[PDB]
Amino acid sequence: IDTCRLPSDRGRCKASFERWYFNGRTCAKFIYGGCGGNGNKFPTQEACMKRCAKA
């Protein structure tokens, strides 16, 4: 699991939506405007846990 290592950006921009991301092993939460994301970013925690907590 090398996707949970990628640093997800919150992308300030003109957006401000709360999303989930991987933090080493556990999940996290912040205001992700939608600018800056690859494989560590995720809308719901269900995917964040199923990608690192379930995998």
Side-chain angles (χ1 to χ4, degrees):
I1 50 136
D2 208 286
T3 308
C4 296
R5 337 216 169 193
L6 314 186
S8 270
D9 236 60
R10 288 168 58 162
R12 223 137 138 295
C13 313
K14 316 126 75 101
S16 169
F17 273 113
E18 49 251 330
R19 310 303 240 295
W20 301 90
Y21 40 110
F22 318 85
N23 199 94
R25 74 91 119 80
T26 359
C27 291
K29 238 201 133 138
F30 52 20
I31 306 297
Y32 178 43
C35 331
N38 32 26
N40 180 263
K41 193 71 237 107
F42 260 110
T44 48
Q45 197 220 74
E46 214 174 294
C48 172
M49 244 243 241
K50 188 202 139 218
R51 257 266 81 167
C52 238
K54 196 150 222 142

